């Protein structure tokens, strides 16, 4: 299988429309696609666009190094 990026919500968010995804603090959201400023996520069977400054992407050890 391949590991998709995951993010943890730093602040709650309420979807402004049906294309966006609401979430709460601590939610672990799986990212399907990245645009500028907005990422497409999936959480508990709901999929939508999220503001990418509301979340922090979890360190993984396959596609990054320092």
């Amino acid at each position: 299988m391949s590991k998709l990026p995951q993010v943890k919500a730093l602040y709650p968010y309420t979807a402004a429309n049906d294309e966006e995804l609401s979430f709460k603090v601590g939610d672990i959201i799986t990212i399907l696609e990245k645009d500028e400023g907005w990422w497409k996520g999936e959480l508990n069977g709901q999929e939508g666009w999220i503001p990418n400054n509301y979340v922090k992407e979890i360190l993984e050890h396959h596609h990054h190094h320092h």
Partner: peptide, 9 residues
Amino acid sequence: KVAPPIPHR
């Protein structure tokens, strides 16, 4: 504890 503004995009 202030949310930032969403990305103007």
